[PDB]
Amino acid sequence: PGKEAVAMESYAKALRMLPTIIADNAGYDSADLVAQLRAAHSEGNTTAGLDMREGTIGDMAILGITESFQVKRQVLLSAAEAAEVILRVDNIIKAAPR
Amino acid sequence: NIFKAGADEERAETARLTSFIGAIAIGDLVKSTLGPKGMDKILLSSGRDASLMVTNDGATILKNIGVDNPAAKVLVDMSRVQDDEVGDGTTSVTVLAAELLREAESLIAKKIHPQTIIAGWREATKAAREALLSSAVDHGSDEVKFRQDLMNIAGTTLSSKLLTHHKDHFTKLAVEAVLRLKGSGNLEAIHIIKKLGGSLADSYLDEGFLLDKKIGVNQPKRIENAKILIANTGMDTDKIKIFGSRVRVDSTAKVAEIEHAEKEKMKEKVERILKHGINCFINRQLIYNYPEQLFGAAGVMAIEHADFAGVERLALVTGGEIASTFDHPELVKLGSCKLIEEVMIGEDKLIHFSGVALGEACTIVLRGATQQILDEAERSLHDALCVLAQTVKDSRTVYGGGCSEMLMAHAVTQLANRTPGKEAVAMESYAKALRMLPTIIADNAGYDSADLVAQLRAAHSEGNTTAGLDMREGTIGDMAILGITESFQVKRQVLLSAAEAAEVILRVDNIIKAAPR
Amino acid sequence: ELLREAESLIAKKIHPQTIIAGWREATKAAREALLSSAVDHGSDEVKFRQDLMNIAGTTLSSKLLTHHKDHFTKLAVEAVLRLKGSGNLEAIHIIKKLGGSLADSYL
Amino acid sequence: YQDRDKPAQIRFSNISAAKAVADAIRTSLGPKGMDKMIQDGKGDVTITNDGATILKQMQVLHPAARMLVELSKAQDIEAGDGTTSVVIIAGSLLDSCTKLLQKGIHPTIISESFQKALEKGIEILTDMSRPVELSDRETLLNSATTSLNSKVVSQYSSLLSPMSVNAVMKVIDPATATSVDLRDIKIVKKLGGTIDDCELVEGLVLTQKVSNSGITRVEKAKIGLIQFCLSAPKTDMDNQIVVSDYAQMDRVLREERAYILNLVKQIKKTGCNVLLIQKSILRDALSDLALHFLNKMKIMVIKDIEREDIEFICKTIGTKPVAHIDQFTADMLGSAELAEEVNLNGSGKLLKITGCASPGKTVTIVVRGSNKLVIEEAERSIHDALCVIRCLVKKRALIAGGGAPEIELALRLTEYSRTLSGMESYCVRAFADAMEVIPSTLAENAGLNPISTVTELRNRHAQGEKTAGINVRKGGISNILEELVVQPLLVSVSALTLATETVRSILKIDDVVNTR
Amino acid sequence: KDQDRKSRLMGLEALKSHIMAAKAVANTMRTSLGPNGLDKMMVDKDGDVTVTNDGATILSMMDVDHQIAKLMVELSKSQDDEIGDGTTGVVVLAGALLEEAEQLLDRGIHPIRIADGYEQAARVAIEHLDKISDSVLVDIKDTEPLIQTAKTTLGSKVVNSCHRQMAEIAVNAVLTVADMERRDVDFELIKVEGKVGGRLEDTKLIKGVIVDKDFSHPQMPKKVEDAKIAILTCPFEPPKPKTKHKLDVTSVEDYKALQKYEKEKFEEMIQQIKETGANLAICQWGFDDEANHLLLQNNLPAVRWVGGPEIELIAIATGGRIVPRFSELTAEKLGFAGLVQEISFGTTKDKMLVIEQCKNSRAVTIFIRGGNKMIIEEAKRSLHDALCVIRNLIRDNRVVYGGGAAEISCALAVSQEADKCPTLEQYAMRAFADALEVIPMALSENSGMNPIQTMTEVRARQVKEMNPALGIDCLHKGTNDMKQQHVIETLIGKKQQISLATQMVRMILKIDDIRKPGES
Amino acid sequence: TEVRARQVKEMNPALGIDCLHKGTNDMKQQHVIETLIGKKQQISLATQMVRMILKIDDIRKPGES
Ligand SMILES: Nc1ncnc2c1ncn2[C@@H]1O[C@H](COP(=O)(O)OP(=O)(O)O)[C@@H](O)[C@H]1O
Ligand SMILES: Nc1ncnc2c1ncn2[C@@H]1O[C@H](COP(=O)(O)OP(=O)(O)O)[C@@H](O)[C@H]1O
Ligand SMILES: Nc1ncnc2c1ncn2[C@@H]1O[C@H](COP(=O)(O)OP(=O)(O)O)[C@@H](O)[C@H]1O
């Protein structure tokens, strides 16, 4: 539906900022590397990633870089759940210090 | 002492802001007028109170407002071209261009070069232009369907105008004028009469190219096989368009000599006119009553007090010639007209032609309480005749109400999948600028734009290249069923003129102002 | 980053609860994408053992062991293959003694 | 929300300026309206309660506030009554809009909603009205007489009211025509005499004298209108008259007489026996020599006449304007049976011309009185009589006063909003609550409680009809139908029509741009 | 006098203040470098507005009150005569050398010592350009490749849509007004005009002169093929003054007498045209109806209302003289031309006089057409540098690969030679190397790429891959090696760039005090 | 207003608001029902608190000097 579409894009946009920050800290052009991964994965090539060693894009299957499934699943859930709590709050009640 | 005493220069940091702030301001100025539910706006010149007025025309707002910023003057001049040339899309061009620069300012904040932005917008404009070409629908046969499309396009142009309440009557006038034309879309053949009295619904029509002028004092109400001879010269009295030359007057006898000398000059000029062997004379300057009877004795129709458009329009309607001077006879093209009859509409004598060569012309007779009503009636109606004439030359049509703008924006997002890195982020902003057009049409109407516009994305993303905004009910519906459509050349020029306008601003990075005199 | 964007949406007259409805739907499609992209190893344990070295090389990044990271990829993967049980590392002792380079770490 | 861009500040700026004009003019509503003190810049001070006069003497500078001033002028032209009630209604609707805009409702939704209340509102007032017969001169007499009692002149209403009833019924077909032109009935007045002395002339009556002309009478006159000034030769450009001796000086007089007579000869050829000279001050409109030549041709001199006075003569006899003697002809002539200038004791030197014999329906009223004020209020009262009668011709109906139309309108609109769906419910309820400002203002001026008066009447209207309204003559709620305090339907309908269009127009203002 | 309130600025702070003034003009113009250069918005003093990325036009309209900036603007008058296109390369290189000098002033080096090093490094670089250069038309005069060079030049302008046609006319124009063997092409003989309407594809070459003036009558012959043209100051009619005649006719007694004298002068002079043998009679003023009625009977075309400087150019182009009065006419004072035609423009009544020679000429005018005046204005300058590109190739066909290839190769030679100069000028030579890199480093920046990564990547390619220099692909073409892209700049231009830049840096460095009296 | 109009125009029985974004209104289908004693005391306690607050026009508290 309408309003939920805009919220989904911000969720995807947040995930895209992770390789942006990984590339920025390494000193490479994060706008080119991340936008090239987006253009790649949108049409096949579901194995592309960043190559911090060479400073470009490469196939993670060939280069031999991988991470556990249980780790990424918890990172996705713990982040959305943690953000859900903060976003659901609208008023803070501070009590007197003891 | 680099730039002082009037001369100024804005550096790259400030000129980048002043260039966009000047252009974006003009967009946010008249974006409220976008759509049929557009918001009005007051115009009040400083120092004078009689200049008050209220309007929701995006073109009229930009013409009167003065502009000191050079970046804004480019965007305003590019908008006035759309109003004078095309007659529609003046507001969409200003809004689409400004929304592109608004997004571009966010891109340069991300250290995206202006040249990298321009490369993406050029590729997006091609994919966006290709979307309208595929979704465009022409009508070679089925003139009923083609006639219905002209009625829908007429309502869209007349939306948010003075004639929007009774548009159902004016849609039959403008379309009948262009339908009766059926050929070259010269709006010169389409006269617009303006006379007092009656409501807007009382606007009559005449297919014989009715005129807005009365002639002579006692002229014939019917002439058979009239030969048209147009002219432009002094024919009332002497010293026409002469200032400084005087005449000595010692007694009334010299005034009688001027009366004889006047009649002598009118006699010789009336002789040269009749030497052509004609039956109808037209002149821009007034015809005095004395030569009227000389033409009356010859049975020539003495038409007087013609305007510049009258000589420009009557020459082609009757197939005649301008022929300002008539010194030598039988050296100009005489027109062709069967009958020049008198007609009374609005308590005024009017000139009605018939059987003229190339008689596809016509005239639309407006009716109103004053001239301010008739002036705005002519402007919005002429704007409809412009795009309608363009619709005859190009029968392609596209669905409005956010269907075309959202369809083009979808192709750009598809193009963003196959493109280099930085061009993707720039093309994504080109789509958002197109999506902000229906967002503004919904916001001005009071509907939830975030719900309607986001729903159209899911609609167009999975087939359904017809969905748009239903301003009547406030929801989404098929534009074809609801009867909303716009010309292809209008949306084409709106896309290109907006991209070309914003492309000029990004290429600018430093405004230079010398010492004003 | 999710909250940084949510702050922008709230400025656009978007309710927080409407945003949570989208993030919940988005988290479903994201998990489904991981499963289709995940590639387990039911056979070819050598390929699996090769992957465990990549997990160690990725996890040990940005640490002081970058000088001899290739050595620690073998120790951590070797000690894990000896366990063959629950993930309780209480059975796996750790020793901290000075002297020698990082490549001299024994198992 | 952030609300970075704040174009709503211009709405509150236009609403506050619009509400300010209404808050000032509110207390002056009704017969018991509290007077107001206006002080001219020179030093003069005056006191009045007419809301129309107060708005003109306010010097309004804001654009939105000027729309209420021009709005009040529209009510005067259309209806001629309820000038103050319109501005009060618009100020309350905009004040009610300030509550809706804070709730997040768009001006376009508020604008379209108010039109639905206006559409249902006109049906409510039209259903509860009292139709009357226009040909029945009994209802028109008591209607204007009782209404004129509420005006300034309460004693001489019985004389001037039927003069206007006959003046309209004479020129207007009773119960056949729907439109009426007040300009077709001119009202002349001069000092001396009394209000009892009046004459409804079937022809026309003017105020200027035909002197120094000695004709004084032209029977079967073909009246004509010529704007070009008849006089000796004159040239605006640089010129010089030549005079060689006393003969040339006296010869120019013979040539000056010719130039005046040459234009008269062309007028004599058309049979025009009476000339209407437009009033002119920039040059001599009619020299002294022109008088005797016009007396020779037996033409009556009519000069120094106003264009509006010529406009009454235009439709009366069918004369057209002639800007030059060369264009003067016979087709542009009126007609007259017997022209003459009457000089009575109190009526003065009036130009009475009877027997027009032309297509047209016009009359004229002669009036007399001791002082200028005695005749001034007589003509002011005739206009309100003609205005209220004009309201009945267009809308043959009557309705009660005392704000009762606003209570029935506010009562049933609240019931109508319950059936509506969407934002129109609160927008129409706010339209209903805004109408209650009128009777609460009448109750306040009458010394009553503004709340308990309208609160009591809203129950009497739910149970009864529109007869229940505020009666200031007795100082309390009474059956207005028995008190004979009524107004035509066009006043209440045109008020909601023109006021709502102004509120919709003001609501659509997103911002104002200063041009140059 | 006027010492009070006298502006003064001296010391080392003045030199850094002068450098700050030059960097402001260089940083302003380095963005407009290359074909992808960012334009500049000009706000005229009379309210007019224009947009352009031309280095010379930016300096001309730039109203700078600083004295150091005015000297940098004066260099454009000397640079555009030789190069025309890249005046930005001199200002950018000058500002770059001055910025690097600021690092040397802090080290304690004198400004004259810095200028001595740049002059030594300029001769090192200018000597390097002569080696790596390449010829096009060595030992033979040809038109095939010479046209191709100009086609890439106009592509940098708004007229890129019609760049292929104007290049051929540019070669015939320069070859017509002067020979390649003569090696002397004069811009004064070359003129450029135009009018709104049409497109840039309708650009034409008229061997002679064109002026926006019409014939004396539309009934005149539209073709004067014979080479006999009279150029008088007055028309062949009764002589009149320059402003107003004011003939005094009291009554008919004077009319019939003066009309006979006037009619006699009508027949006398109109028949004098065929006496001297002139077919066309060009006159500063117009002809009367009696005159044109007699010209038609004699078949004598004539031009009316010709302007002041227009009458001068017609005499020069046709080879005639400005005849002051008909009595001075002769066979020698008649002009020469092969065909005179009246060319209208659609529905406009301009009808410019087109004097064709029907053979090779020595002066040629260039007529431009388009849908906008400002695009026609920028189109006029687009040929001016093309004339320099052709003129530079004619003076010397040797050229160097552009796109930054020359600057990067010279920087390596200047850097190596700096090791051989044991003196304080060594730091200035290294500064000359880094300053040379700013031109190519500015091109990559204006295109939207990483400057330093694209800079050093081409350096190692110029050192490791191959010895021939390689440029930057700023147009986003396939790759580097601009020789394949056919982007080649002239050798005389690059030498004048480094020369004028070193001169402009030398002049600003040897200046150490500015004085000016203020308003008392 | 849409729910209120449905309580008159569409049908006379009461209909609620679909806050959980279920199928539609008419909470009777959604099985969302509150106690009658709950609503009676809800608006009664609310009115009693409003009367207790409306009948207070002076909050006097001595300050520390
Ligand atoms: N009936 C309608 N339904 C939906 N949208 C409409 C309708 N009529 C006009 N519009 C929209 O209003 C916008 C402006 O129309 P118009 O006033 O003709 O051009 P401009 O505002 O540029 O003068 C168009 O983009 C069109 O999509
Ligand atoms: N004699 C009266 N008794 C009761 N109400 C009256 C009386 N006269 C006028 N009113 C009320 O006062 C209001 C204003 O009347 P009026 O003064 O004629 O118009 P305005 O105040 O606009 O000039 C009307 O709505 C009418 O109902
Ligand atoms: N077509 C091209 N492709 C690549 N580089 C170019 C091209 N044209 C010019 N250049 C480079 O850009 C620099 C300046 O180009 P240009 O703007 O055309 O001249 P100028 O800066 O003098 O106006 C030159 O030094 C040259 O190396």
Secondary structure of chain A in the HEC alphabet? CHHHHHHHHHHHHHHHHHHHHHHHHHCCCHHHHHHHHHHHHCCCCCCEEEECCCCEEEEHHHHCCCCCHHHHHHHHHHHHHHHHHHHHCCCCCCCCCC
Cα separation, B480 vs B464, whole angstroms: 12
Neighbours of E102 (CB within 10 A): 15
Neighbours of E467 (CB within 10 A): 8
| Final residue of a structural domain among E309, E340, E361 | E361
Cα separation, B110 vs A13, whole angstroms: 15
What single-letter amino acid sits at B287?
I
CA end-to-end span of chain A: 49
Length of chain A in residues, anyone?
98
Can you give the C-alpha Rg of chain B in angstroms?
28
What are the phi and psi torsion angles at D210 (to 5°)?
-90, 5
Q: Any residues with CB less than 8 A from the CB of B390 and at least 6 apart, and which?
A: B86, B185, B487, B489, B490
**Tokens standing for residue E451:** 């400057």
Cα separation, B444 vs D453, whole angstroms: 41
**Tokens standing for residue E162:** 């019609």
The one-character DSSP state at C68 is: T
Cα separation, D499 vs D87, whole angstroms: 7
Domain co-membership, E117 together with E17: yes
E493 lines ligand 3 (CB under 6 A): no
Number of domains in chain E: 3
Cα separation, B62 vs B28, whole angstroms: 12
Neighbours of D16 (CB within 10 A): 15
Cβ-contact E191, E352 below 8 angstroms: no
Q: Which of E409, E414, E388 is nearest to E490 (CA)?
A: E388
E89 lines ligand 3 (CB under 6 A): yes
Cα separation, E280 vs E208, whole angstroms: 16
- Distance between alpha carbon E475 and the CA centroid of its chain, in Å? 25
Q: Any residues with CB less than 8 A from the CB of D339 and at least 6 apart, and which?
A: D217, D218, D219, D221, D274, D300, D351, D353
Length of chain B in residues, anyone?
517
Collapsed DSSP state (helix, strand, coil) of residue B475: strand
Cα separation, E98 vs E104, whole angstroms: 10
Subunit contact B425:A3, Cβ cutoff 8 A: no
Collapsed DSSP state (helix, strand, coil) of residue D502: helix
Q: Which of B92, B79, B81, B97 is nearest to B38 (CA)?
A: B92
Neighbours of D179 (CB within 10 A): 8
Cα separation, A5 vs A1, whole angstroms: 6
Cβ-contact D506, D94 below 8 angstroms: yes
Convert B276-321 into a string of H (helix), E (strand) and C (coil). Answer: CCCCEEEECCCCCHHHHHHHHHCCCEEECCCCHHHHHHHHHHCCCC
Collapsed DSSP state (helix, strand, coil) of residue B341: strand
Q: Any residues with CB less than 8 A from the CB of E140 and at least 6 apart, and which?
A: none
> How would you list the strands of the sheet with D363-369, edge to edge?
D185-191, D363-369, D198-201
Residue whose entry in the numeric block shows the structure tokens 């000088």: C67
What are the phi and psi torsion angles at E237 (to 5°)?
-160, 180
Domain co-membership, E125 together with E173: no
Q: Which of B233, B219, B326 is nearest to B271 (CA)?
A: B326
Give chain C's contact residues with A (Cβ, < 8 Å).
Answer: 1-6, 8-9, 12, 14, 16-27, 30-31, 34, 37-38, 50-51, 54-55, 57-58
Residue E175, CB half-sphere, CA atoms under 13 Å: how many? 13
Report the DSSP beta bridge partners of residue E197: E370
| Final residue of a structural domain among E361, E387, E414 | E361
User: In what helix (H) or strand (E) does residue B228 lie, and over which residues does it extend?
Assistant: strand B228-231
Neighbours of B496 (CB within 10 A): 14
Subunit contact D422:F1, Cβ cutoff 8 A: yes
Cα separation, E193 vs E376, whole angstroms: 9
User: In what helix (H) or strand (E) does residue D54 lie, and over which residues does it extend?
Assistant: helix D51-56
- CA–centroid distance, residue E51 to ligand 3 (Å): 19
Collapsed DSSP state (helix, strand, coil) of residue B370: coil
Residue D139 known to be catalytic: no
**Annotated active-site positions of E, please?**
54, 87-88, 385
Domain co-membership, E257 together with E354: yes
DSSP percent split of chain D into helix, strand, coil, nearest 5? 50, 20, 35
Cα separation, B79 vs B98, whole angstroms: 12
Cβ-contact B437, B98 below 8 angstroms: no
| Final residue of a structural domain among E381, E397, E413 | E397
**Tokens standing for residue B67:** 């502009």
Q: List CB contacts (< 8 A) between B1 and chain E.
A: 65-67
Q: Is the peptide bond before D212 cis (omega within 30 degrees of 0)?
A: yes
Q: List CB contacts (< 8 A) between C14 and chain B.
A: 450
Nearest-5° Cα angle at B301, B297 to B303: 125
What single-letter amino acid sits at D428?
V
List own/partner pairs for A48-57 with CB under 8 A and 24 or more apart: A49/A19, A50/A19, A50/A22, A50/A23, A52/A22, A52/A26, A55/A26, A55/A28, A57/A33
Collapsed DSSP state (helix, strand, coil) of residue F7: helix
| Site from B455, B462, B476 to mutate, A interface, most A CB atoms within 10 angstroms | B455
Instruction: Describe the crossing of helices D489-507 and D83-102 by its angle, rounded to 10 degrees.
Output: 40
Cα separation, B419 vs B508, whole angstroms: 26
Annotated binding residue A72: yes
Q: How far is CA E306 from CA E210, E226, E299, E447, F17, in A?
A: 11, 21, 20, 49, 87
Length of chain D in residues, anyone?
516
Buried b (16+ CB within 10 A) or exposed e, C37-57: eeeeeeeeeeeeeebbbbbbb
E40/B contact by beta carbon, under 8 A: yes
Domain co-membership, E375 together with E418: no
Residue B70: exposed, middle, or buried by beta-carbon count in 10 A (0-12, 13-18, 19+)? buried
Q: List CB contacts (< 8 A) between B450 and chain C.
A: 12-14
Neighbours of B183 (CB within 10 A): 11
Cα separation, D389 vs D137, whole angstroms: 11
Q: Which of E50, E152, E60, E156 is nearest to E372 (CA)?
A: E50
Q: List CB contacts (< 8 A) between C1 and chain A.
A: 13-14, 17-18
Residue D238 known to be catalytic: no
Residue D425, CB half-sphere, CA atoms under 13 Å: how many? 12
Can you give the C-alpha Rg of chain F in angstroms?
20
Please name the chains neighbouring B, where neighbouring means 3+ C-beta pairs under 8 angstroms.
A, C, D, E
Domain co-membership, E193 together with E298: no
Collapsed DSSP state (helix, strand, coil) of residue B8: strand
Q: Any residues with CB less than 8 A from the CB of B284 and at least 6 apart, and which?
A: B231, B232, B233, B305, B306, B307, B308, B310, B311
Cα separation, E233 vs E485, whole angstroms: 55
Cα separation, B286 vs D18, whole angstroms: 51
Collapsed DSSP state (helix, strand, coil) of residue D202: coil
What are the phi and psi torsion angles at E276 (to 5°)?
-75, -15
Q: What ranges make up the beta strands (E) of D128-197?
A: 185-191
- CA–centroid distance, residue E52 to ligand 3 (Å): 15
Domain co-membership, E354 together with E220: yes
Report the DSSP beta bridge partners of residue D354: D338
Residue whose entry in the numeric block shows the structure tokens 């080290």: E107
Domain co-membership, E248 together with E336: yes
Domain co-membership, E128 together with E158: no
The one-character DSSP state at D333 is: B
Cα separation, D233 vs D256, whole angstroms: 7
**Tokens standing for residue B218:** 């006692």
Report the DSSP beta bridge partners of residue B349: B344
Q: Any residues with CB less than 8 A from the CB of D211 and at least 6 apart, and which?
A: D301
Helical H runs in D370-449? 372-394, 404-419, 424-435, 437-445
**Tokens standing for residue B53:** 């007025």
Domain co-membership, E38 together with E57: yes
C10/D contact by beta carbon, under 8 A: yes
Neighbours of D440 (CB within 10 A): 25
Neighbours of D335 (CB within 10 A): 18
Cα separation, E352 vs E342, whole angstroms: 6
- Distance between alpha carbon C50 and the CA centroid of its chain, in Å? 15
Cβ-contact D510, B41 below 8 angstroms: yes
Residue whose entry in the numeric block shows the structure tokens 């044109």: E292
Report the DSSP beta bridge partners of residue B228: B280
Cβ-contact D395, D489 below 8 angstroms: yes
Pairing of strands E364-370, E190-196: parallel
**Tokens standing for residue B63:** 């013409």
Cβ-contact B494, B95 below 8 angstroms: no
Report the DSSP beta bridge partners of residue B54: B42
Report which protein residue has its CA nearest ligand 1's atom 7: B156
Q: How far is CA E3 from CA B200, E8, E518, F7, in A?
A: 78, 10, 8, 93
Residue whose entry in the numeric block shows the structure tokens 């209440």: D492
Cα separation, B30 vs B286, whole angstroms: 44
Cβ-contact B99, B436 below 8 angstroms: yes
Residue D236 known to be catalytic: no
Convert E209-269 into a string of H (helix), E (strand) and C (coil). Answer: EEECCCECCCCCCCECCCCCEEEECCCCCCCCCCCCCCCCCCCHHHHHHHHHHHHHHHHHH
Q: Any residues with CB less than 8 A from the CB of D58 and at least 6 apart, and which?
A: D21, D24, D69
Collapsed DSSP state (helix, strand, coil) of residue F3: helix
Whose atoms come closest to the Cα of B386: which ligand?
A: 1
Helical H runs in E32-191? 55-61, 67-79, 88-106, 111-132, 144-154, 163-177
Collapsed DSSP state (helix, strand, coil) of residue B101: helix
Q: How far is CA B394 from CA B178, B188, B381, in A?
A: 13, 19, 20
**Tokens standing for residue E115:** 């200028």
E63/B contact by beta carbon, under 8 A: yes
Helical H runs in D237-288? 246-269
Cβ-contact B364, B191 below 8 angstroms: yes
What single-letter amino acid sits at A34?
V
The one-character DSSP state at B397 is: E
User: In what helix (H) or strand (E) does residue B204 lie, and over which residues does it extend?
Assistant: strand B204-206
Look at phi and psi of residue A11 and say left if phi exceeds 0, alpha if psi is from -120 to 50, else beta: alpha
| Domain coverage including residue E460 | 1-136+398-520
Atom of ligand 2 nearest to the CA of D84: 22
Q: How far is CA D135 from CA B232, D141, D491, E268, in A?
A: 59, 11, 21, 93
Nearest-5° Cα angle at E260, E254 to E263: 130
Residue D83 known to be catalytic: yes
Domain co-membership, E294 together with E422: no
Torsion of CA E326, E330, E336, E342, to 10 degrees: 20
Cα separation, D386 vs D130, whole angstroms: 20
User: In what helix (H) or strand (E) does residue D367 lie, and over which residues does it extend?
Assistant: strand D363-369
DSSP percent split of chain F into helix, strand, coil, nearest 5? 50, 0, 50
For chain D, the structural domain boundaries read 1-132+397-516, 133-202+362-396, 203-361
Cα separation, B118 vs E447, whole angstroms: 10
- Largest CA-CA distance found in chain C, in angstroms, rounded: 63
What are the phi and psi torsion angles at E200 (to 5°)?
-70, -15
Whose atoms come closest to the Cα of B30: which ligand?
A: 1
Nearest-5° Cα angle at B120, A43 to B468: 75
Cβ-contact E373, E379 below 8 angstroms: no
